[PDB]
Amino acid sequence: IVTPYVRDAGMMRTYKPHTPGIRHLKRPINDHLWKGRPYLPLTFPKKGQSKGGRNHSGRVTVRHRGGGHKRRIRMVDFERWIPGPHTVLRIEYDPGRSAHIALVKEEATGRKSYIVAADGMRAGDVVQSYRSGLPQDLLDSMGGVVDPGILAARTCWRGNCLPVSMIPVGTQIYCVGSRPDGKAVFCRSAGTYATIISKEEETREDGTKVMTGKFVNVRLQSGEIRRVSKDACATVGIASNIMHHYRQLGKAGRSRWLNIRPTVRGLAMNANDHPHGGGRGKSKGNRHPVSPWGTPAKGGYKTRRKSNVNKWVVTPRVRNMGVRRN
Amino acid sequence: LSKALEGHGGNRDKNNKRSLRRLCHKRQRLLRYMERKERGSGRWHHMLETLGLTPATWKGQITL
RNA sequence: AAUAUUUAUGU
RNA sequence: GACUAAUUACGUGCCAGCAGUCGCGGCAAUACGUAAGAGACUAGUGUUAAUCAUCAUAAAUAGGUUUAAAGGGUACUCAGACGGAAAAAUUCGCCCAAAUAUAGGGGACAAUUUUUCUAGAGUUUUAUGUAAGAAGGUCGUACUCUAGAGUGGAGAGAUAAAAUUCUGUGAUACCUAGGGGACGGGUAAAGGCGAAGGCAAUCUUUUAUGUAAAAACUGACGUCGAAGGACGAAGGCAAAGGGAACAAAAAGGAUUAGAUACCCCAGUAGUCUUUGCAGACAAUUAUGAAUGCCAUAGGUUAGAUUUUUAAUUUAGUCUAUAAAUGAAAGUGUAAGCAUUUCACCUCAAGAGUAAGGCGGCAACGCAGGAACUGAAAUCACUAGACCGUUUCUGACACCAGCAAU
RNA sequence: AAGGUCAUGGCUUAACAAGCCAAUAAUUCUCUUAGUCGAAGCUGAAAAGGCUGAUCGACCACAUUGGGAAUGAAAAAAUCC
RNA sequence: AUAGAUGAGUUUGGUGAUGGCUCUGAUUGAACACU
RNA sequence: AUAAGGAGAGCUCAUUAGUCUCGAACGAGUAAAAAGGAAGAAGCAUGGAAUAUUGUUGUACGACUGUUUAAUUAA
RNA sequence: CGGCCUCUAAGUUUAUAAUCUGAAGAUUAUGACGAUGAGAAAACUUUGGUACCAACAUUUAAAAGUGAAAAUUGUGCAGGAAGGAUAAACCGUACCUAGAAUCUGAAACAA
RNA sequence: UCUUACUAUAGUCAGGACUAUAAAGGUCCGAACGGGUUAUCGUUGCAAAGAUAUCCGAAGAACUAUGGUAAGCGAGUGAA
Ligand SMILES: [K+]
Ligand SMILES: [K+]
Ligand SMILES: [K+]
Ligand SMILES: [K+]
Ligand SMILES: [K+]
Ligand SMILES: [K+]
Ligand SMILES: [K+]
Ligand SMILES: [K+]
Ligand SMILES: [K+]
Ligand SMILES: [Mg+2]
Ligand SMILES: [Mg+2]
Ligand SMILES: [Mg+2]
Ligand SMILES: [Mg+2]
Ligand SMILES: [Mg+2]
Ligand SMILES: [Mg+2]
Ligand SMILES: [Mg+2]
Ligand SMILES: [Mg+2]
Ligand SMILES: [Mg+2]
Ligand SMILES: [Mg+2]
Ligand SMILES: [Mg+2]
Ligand SMILES: [Mg+2]
Ligand SMILES: [Mg+2]
Ligand SMILES: [Mg+2]
Ligand SMILES: [Mg+2]
Ligand SMILES: [Mg+2]
Ligand SMILES: [Mg+2]
Ligand SMILES: [Mg+2]
Ligand SMILES: [Mg+2]
Ligand SMILES: [Mg+2]
Ligand SMILES: [Mg+2]
Ligand SMILES: [Mg+2]
Ligand SMILES: [Mg+2]
Ligand SMILES: [Mg+2]
Ligand SMILES: [Mg+2]
Ligand SMILES: [Mg+2]
Ligand SMILES: [Mg+2]
Ligand SMILES: [Mg+2]
Ligand SMILES: [Mg+2]
Ligand SMILES: [Mg+2]
Ligand SMILES: [Mg+2]
Ligand SMILES: [Mg+2]
Ligand SMILES: [Mg+2]
Ligand SMILES: [Mg+2]
Ligand SMILES: [Mg+2]
Ligand SMILES: [Mg+2]
Ligand SMILES: [Mg+2]
Ligand SMILES: [Mg+2]
Ligand SMILES: [Mg+2]
Ligand SMILES: [Mg+2]
Ligand SMILES: [Mg+2]
Ligand SMILES: [Mg+2]
Ligand SMILES: [Mg+2]
Ligand SMILES: [Mg+2]
Ligand SMILES: [Mg+2]
Ligand SMILES: [Mg+2]
Ligand SMILES: [Mg+2]
Ligand SMILES: [Mg+2]
Ligand SMILES: [Mg+2]
Ligand SMILES: [Mg+2]
Ligand SMILES: [Mg+2]
Ligand SMILES: [Mg+2]
Ligand SMILES: [Mg+2]
Ligand SMILES: [Mg+2]
Ligand SMILES: [Mg+2]
Ligand SMILES: [Mg+2]
Ligand SMILES: [Mg+2]
Ligand SMILES: [Mg+2]
Ligand SMILES: [Mg+2]
């Protein structure tokens, strides 16, 4: 028996090290992905000088960008207002996004749309968004205004978009919004999710809690327990492509294909181009690490504007303080 | 038993791996005796074709 | 009835 | 000197020297060096080297492996050894019986083969009983986190005593409401189950043996088993999860002459899930598996029979004994009488080490010497002594009191 | 099937068949050591005893080392190339 | 070939075992030393 | 690793299962492509002229492919 | 057989509106302009893999071979434009292409 | 209109070999092409950067064409 060229071990793909640039290449295994082209009318090209890191003035405002592969932007639906069932047609790969997208189809009208696919979502699954209100059948089946236990059993399914108030405590969500009528902004990246910590509610004398406040607390991917609107949207599940951060590019040329240009260190420059440049030989100049414009690059210096206080935070993030993790 | 060691989590059942080996060996000792005793009688061929018992089940050494 | 300091050496 | 037949005197004084083994010599040496005597062999006599025997000390005749060198981690199993009853055919093995014996005789036994038998080994009849195993789910006691603008308002926790530490950002304590992980109280026993390793909350699903009684069935189909393969505790490697609790490491506080440590505040790997690697254990009954056999008693486990009250009985397990066995301790369902088979041992130490090789990602594992150096290593028991050992017995030994230094 | 042979055997050949030996090392390879055997010598009470492989007899190999052939009834040479 | 089978010293406070070493017997195509 | 180190090569020719051609299954043919052998001839020499610039070993530095002072430093 | 002409990319804009701004101006939207691309017919003519026309590979105008064009199928990840559609005017046409008289290198320059 | 980077639209890379692929490689040998390692020549040079030979990359972080954007109080661009 001979070892195959493609070597699957766990959930990652490695290849025969027949070149020094392919020895450390590691890819996550996603074979269920649609192999064709995307839904063209839901896309538009991504071109212009902005691809190189320039703004409307023509000067570089984002360094280390340009020269990547030609791409198209996918119009993903982060609001999901239209109600009714939606059939997942196929899970596609999005170059301008870490997680995967799902081409859904509204069975009522037939219109197609894109949404961030969940971990485990496959073609054929039926997702539904209860953000525009509950349908008459579901309300009648209870026969009452709402029941927290009954609702969660018929709507808290993977891929379903609900108001965070309707999702029970301890559930994992990955498209958490902030405003009552805003789009999903948190945990949209691959493998990210958020947990519902608490809800401003009270007991109704029958053991059934009822919302009393206007917000609910959720722990974000960064470990921050902040406050979010009661009517803010959320999708049940976890963002797909959980093994994204375990990938390895293996060679410099792959980073260039991803629109990333070389990063020149400050020590490598002269005293005129960086606070770290200068000196004969390798020398840091006894200068504390900073950016090319004097911004402390280490030590815990926070770049969030002081006057801009986060009034939605219940428990701030935990600061590692420079201590080694592993 | 062979159908149970192949189902979900069947590989984890490492204690009954000897039970399957003990049944195939207990059957090897009955086929090896029935072959020389029956002298290829019609009663011996009816069991083979019906149960599908090939020579690999008793002739050599069953290694599992 | 479940207490508990310290104690090395000897052609 | 003793082994080993044969003595004194003088000199030397752990010096010089003797010596095959044990040993001798430190100022009155039968052991060294002289003198004499004695014992013995003799043209030979001693010494060195080597071989046989001593040595059953590599045991085929003919050994042994509980505690002294030595039972493999396990049993399914190819090869290979061994293995029923009553007849028959062939070999003429075996025997007369040799001379490597032509040709015959004898038939108990042996080999291949044939026909029958049922005591061995199996199958059926849902056994009972049972922490073997595996899958998918759950339960609960405590713990832990968060929340309530909780009550309460200065202590708590730790230890022999403390310190580091927690607490006014409201702890400990007493509650309410949620989240999250692993753990398995009682029942519980000398108890049971699997090849062993090992297996103890619960529901359902799933899995091979084993045990009892009756009949029925197959008709020797059996036991052991190098290697290969499979399984194999904890710890560990690898990948992806989980992370309350415990806890190597690292670090801090004490103790101490010093303290890496034992003790303490905390704490990362790791323990847990999934998939592989790894294969080493006081993997133990310090006792390989299996078969036949030997006298009783008191418990106990799962059945059966009965005049089921209580007595018989099958298969296990555990104490105490008889004959016997053993170095003895002890065993006595075996460490006895025998038998079969596999593994292993041949003075200690070097050494389970070296070198090459094989396996593994690694850690390491399998396998496995020789040189140099010794006359001893080693087991069980016996009587004492000792114990920061138990329980007693005497003493101004101590306690108490008085007096004194 | 045919030849060959006193006779037998792929001994030899033609045409078919895919067998034969072995499976635990048949076979092959590397290393260390050695002339083999005999109441021939020594030894033990003895074991199908052990050791040696001098003098004695039988066998094998060699003749500076390596590589080779012929003559002859037969290499069985301290020969010959 | 029917006479042919043997022990001793040395481990321990001591006893009994296990287990090596050495001695006692015979010998050499022997060597050395004193003769 | 195209490691190293070797062998072969042109011309004439025996030979030919199929393909192709010719004549009439067969026969013939390289004024068909190919295959082909320990065959042969000539010369000092048949990779004949031209084209492809050695091999091996031990170190330091930097993993590697790349980039740089246009026009003295390519590392 | 190209331009002109139609459509648009990267972009531009003393065009319009709104907004920001010491003045100059800048921003966003729309419009206009803007090829290095796309544009019917002819040896006579006037929806989104039901997809798409990036790279690579394959197949296909039937005697064979070869080179294109266009299309078919498939592969890899680096995931691969926009918009409009669908009786003959005007402008270019000469020569030179760098070893033998013409382009750039100060020039009849071994670049 | 040079040059650095980016951008849009386009174009180019004989033949052969290895590798799991018919096509999956900052793979290999080597032209065009792109570089400029070493030496010589030249130095009022043919040339204010050339010639010859040798050497390196040559399916890529490649090369090339026509346009566009970003530069001069603050520094544009910069694999530095
Ligand atoms: K054992
Ligand atoms: K006879
Ligand atoms: K019968
Ligand atoms: K005994
Ligand atoms: K050693
Ligand atoms: K350059
Ligand atoms: K202005
Ligand atoms: K030229
Ligand atoms: K090359
Ligand atoms: Mg950056
Ligand atoms: Mg970086
Ligand atoms: Mg850098
Ligand atoms: Mg520098
Ligand atoms: Mg500075
Ligand atoms: Mg320096
Ligand atoms: Mg398990
Ligand atoms: Mg002492
Ligand atoms: Mg005496
Ligand atoms: Mg003497
Ligand atoms: Mg002594
Ligand atoms: Mg004397
Ligand atoms: Mg004499
Ligand atoms: Mg073992
Ligand atoms: Mg062991
Ligand atoms: Mg007979
Ligand atoms: Mg019967
Ligand atoms: Mg029976
Ligand atoms: Mg039962
Ligand atoms: Mg309060
Ligand atoms: Mg509180
Ligand atoms: Mg739980
Ligand atoms: Mg055990
Ligand atoms: Mg319990
Ligand atoms: Mg049992
Ligand atoms: Mg067995
Ligand atoms: Mg084995
Ligand atoms: Mg383990
Ligand atoms: Mg582990
Ligand atoms: Mg890990
Ligand atoms: Mg420590
Ligand atoms: Mg400490
Ligand atoms: Mg702790
Ligand atoms: Mg294993
Ligand atoms: Mg065994
Ligand atoms: Mg009993
Ligand atoms: Mg028991
Ligand atoms: Mg007993
Ligand atoms: Mg030893
Ligand atoms: Mg070793
Ligand atoms: Mg070993
Ligand atoms: Mg005692
Ligand atoms: Mg007193
Ligand atoms: Mg007193
Ligand atoms: Mg020799
Ligand atoms: Mg001789
Ligand atoms: Mg003692
Ligand atoms: Mg010649
Ligand atoms: Mg380099
Ligand atoms: Mg390079
Ligand atoms: Mg230069
Ligand atoms: Mg240079
Ligand atoms: Mg226009
Ligand atoms: Mg154009
Ligand atoms: Mg000119
Ligand atoms: Mg010129
Ligand atoms: Mg290359
Ligand atoms: Mg000159
Ligand atoms: Mg190269």
C1' of D240 to CA of A10 (Å): 8
Whether A256 sits with its Cβ under 7 A from any strand G atom: the answer reads no
CB A154 within 8 A of CB A220: no
The b/e string for A254-290 (b: 16+ C-beta within 10 A; e otherwise) is ebbeebbeeeeebeeeeeeebbbbeeeeeeeeeeeeb
Between the CA of B2 and the centroid of ligand 27 the distance, in Å, is 29
How many Å apart are CA A281 and CA B15, to the nearest integer? 66
Distance CA A292, CA A135 (A): 56
A212-249: buried (b, 16+ CB within 10 Å) or exposed (e) per residue?
Answer: eeebbbbbbbeebbbbbbbbbbbbbbbbbbbbbeebeb
Instruction: Calculate how far, in angstroms, residue A324's C-alpha sits from the geometric centre of ligand 40.
Output: 20
Protein CA at A28 to nucleotide C1' at D61, angstroms: 75
| Count of CB atoms situated within 10 Å of the CB of A187 | 25
Resolution in A: 3.0
Q: Helix, strand or coil for residue A37?
A: coil
Which residues, 6 or more positions from B22, have their beta carbon under 8 angstroms from its beta carbon? none
Strand G closer than 7 Å to the CB of A24? Answer: yes
What is the helix, strand, coil percentage profile of chain A, to 5?
Answer: 10, 30, 60
Q: Is the dihedral of CA A23, A24, A28, A33 positive or negative?
A: negative
Supply angle C-alpha A24, A26, A28, rounded to 5: 175
How many C-beta atoms surround the C-beta of residue A96 within 10 A?
11
Provide CB contacts within 8 A for B40, sequence distance 6+.
none
Instruction: Compute CA distances A219 → A56, A214, A253, whole Å.
Output: 38, 17, 38
**How many whole angstroms from its chain centre is CA A162?**
18
Residue A59, CB, less than 7 Å from strand H? no
Q: How far is the CA of A246 from the C1' of H88 (A)?
A: 69
At a CB cut-off of 8 Å and minimum separation 6, what does A285 contact? Answer: A275, A276, A278, A279
Q: Give the span between the Cα atoms of A21 and A102, in whole angstroms.
A: 33
Report whether B18 contacts B26 (CB < 8 A): no
Q: Could you tell me if residue A84 is left (phi over 0), alpha (psi between -120 and 50 degrees) or otherwise beta?
A: left
d(CA A225, CA A215): 12
Paired strand residues for A102: A91, A115
Closest CA to A137 of A207, A80, A180, A83: A83
